Each structure stands twice: as structure tokens, then as C-alpha cells.
Design a protein around this ligand. Structure first.
Ligand SMILES: CCCCCCCCO[C@@H]1O[C@H](CO)[C@@H](O)[C@H](O)[C@H]1O
Length: 273
């Protein structure tokens, strides 16, 4: 069953015990129903099932962002399609396996360019994901989801890093906001004392929790970026460069400085830690 998607932020990234990666709540909800249900007829049937799952995923993603056609939505479409890809192609880092065996007993157990099969049609799966929204907007529909960037095949590690980047850059002003709202004091307050006092202390340590799991996540995922190329190698090198390419304003310095709690704001508001 593909259930209604939970709000982004309700469950942060999950770096499971003893694992090579960190997974988002966006994929734990990824519609994989018709896949985990099951000549050329086989490939056609799997194609249709994937059409169903992709369409439902698109619809539930639209519902997830309160029926708002925007950048976050397009991003989620991109990630979902990519993950669908690594599922089909079988190059998924993530840990079921009933679809990894179903899609195996339907095609091949030696060399498997199901690669090309996905390549032959992923555009169509994409229109399947974009189906709901476009059928809802009708004539009023416009293309704000840049297509060939969305269809361009890339190792998920990359995709998940971009997604994580958007998540972090989206959560940061919120956390800084609530921290500042519960710690900021007038210029004649000793902010050390305010920091110690319960209200600002709890908030500061909550911030600490958030930035701690943020650094843990980025650690695992970056070690994971450097994990792959070595093993895989074969279009960018600086893991950060990906992040440099994702959002409008990103400098490495401020980032490292933020996740290592060497932040100016954090060190000013809560110095009692
Ligand atoms: C010389 C150092 C004295 C510092 C006094 C800072 C003035 C604090 O004063 C307060 O600042 C608030 C805004 O920060 C205002 O909203 C308040 O009306 C004001 O009482």
C-alpha cells in the first residue's frame, strides 16, 4: 500500500545502524506497490505496473506539498524517478529485495542491461509521474520542471546528496529561527546567564541535536561519496561541488563552520555548552 506522504521534516534522514548510507523519509514512502506484487508480455506488464506506481507517487507527492506546483515538487519528482531507476537497473545502494528478485526472475541473471530497458523508457515513466498535476491544471499547465536534467541518469549517491542539501538548507533558517526566538536577549542581558537559564538552554541543546545529526548524516554521505568513485569511478569530483551546484548561495567555509558548531550565531546565543 502506498500511503499518504508525511510532511518533509517529520522524520529526518535515517542513518541506520551499521550501514553505508543515510536514507530519507522521501524514499521510505516511495510507491513500490505494483512492483512488489507482480516473452515481451512480461516487460510490458512490468512497464504498466511501474506506470501505476510512478503515477501514484507523483500524485501523492503533489498532495504532500499541499497541491503546490513548485521547485520542491519538481525536485521530489526528480528523486523519485531516479530511485525508480536504480531500482529497475538494480544499482540501488539501499537495503525487502522481493522486487530485486521479482525484477530478476523476469529478465536476466547474467549480464543485465535492463539499463537500456530503463533508458528506452524513463521519459514515459516521467510523464506518468507528472500526469496528475497536468491533468489537474489542464490548459493552465506550464513546464517549470526542467526535463533533461530530470531525465539525465546519475548515481543516486549524487541525487541523495542534492536532496540532503536542499533539506539542510531548508531546515537551517528554521532552526536558527527557533533558537534565536527562544534565546535572543537585549544588549544589557548577560547572554551567558540567559544561555544557562532553562528556556535558552533547552533550545540551544535542541539545536545541538539537530546540527549533530546533520553532521553525522553529512559525514556518512560524504564518506559514501568518496566510497563510490574509488570503487566505481567512470562527472564531478568535489563532493561539495554538487552542493555548490544545487542552491543559490553556498560557500564551503560557512557550511563546515556551521556543521562543526563553530557558527557565529550558535556560539553567541548559546556559549554555555
Ligand atoms: C551601552 C550598552 C547598552 C545596551 C542597551 C541596548 C538597548 C536595549 O534596550 C532594549 O532593546 C530592544 C531592542 O534590542 C528594544 O526593543 C527595547 O525597547 C529596549 O528596551
Amino acid at each position: 500500500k502506498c500511503n499518504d506522504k508525511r510532511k518533509r521534516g517529520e522524520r529526518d534522514w535515517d542513518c541506520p545502524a551499521e550501514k553505508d548510507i543515510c536514507i530519507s523519509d522521501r524514499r521510505y514512502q516511495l510507491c513500490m506497490k505494483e512492483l512488489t506484487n507482480l516473452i515481451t508480455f512480461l516487460k510490458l506488464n512490468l512497464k504498466r505496473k511501474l506506470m501505476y506506481d510512478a503515477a501514484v507517487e507523483g500524485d501523492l507527492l503533489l498532495k504532500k506539498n499541499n497541491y503546490q506546483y513548485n521547485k520542491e515538487f519538481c525536485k521530489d519528482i526528480r528523486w523519485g524517478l531516479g530511485d525508480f531507476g536504480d531500482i529497475i537497473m538494480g544499482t540501488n545502494m539501499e537495503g525487502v529485495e522481493n522486487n530485486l528478485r521479482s525484477i530478476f526472475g523476469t529478465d536476466e541473471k547474467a549480464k543485465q542491461d535492463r539499463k537500456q530497458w530503463w533508458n528506452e523508457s524513463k521519459e514515459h515513466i516521467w510523464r506518468a509521474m507528472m500526469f496528475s498535476l497536468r491533468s489537474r491544471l489542464k490548459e493552465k499547465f506550464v513546464w517549470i520542471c526542467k526535463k533533461d536534467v530530470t531525465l539525465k541518469v546519475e548515481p543516486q549517491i549524487y541525487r541523495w546528496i542534492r536532496e540532503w542539501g536542499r533539506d539542510y538548507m531548508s531546515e537551517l533558517p528554521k532552526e536558527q529561527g527557533k533558537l534565536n526566538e527562544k534565546c535572543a536577549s537585549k544588549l544589557y542581558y548577560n547572554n551567558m546567564a540567559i544561555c544557562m537559564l532553562p528556556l535558552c538552554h533547552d533550545a540551544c541543546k535542541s539545536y545541538d541535536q539537530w546540527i549533530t545529526r546533520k553532521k553525522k548524516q553529512w559525514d556518512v554521505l560524504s564518506t559514501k561519496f568518496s566510497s563510490v568513485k574509488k570503487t566505481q569511478k567512470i562527472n564531478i569530483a568535489t563532493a561539495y561541488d554538487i552542493l555548490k551546484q544545487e542552491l543559490n548561495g553556498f560557500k564551503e567555509a560557512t557550511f563546515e563552520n556551521e556543521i562543526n558548531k563553530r557558527d557565529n550565531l550558535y556560539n553567541h546565543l548559546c556559549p554555555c555548552v
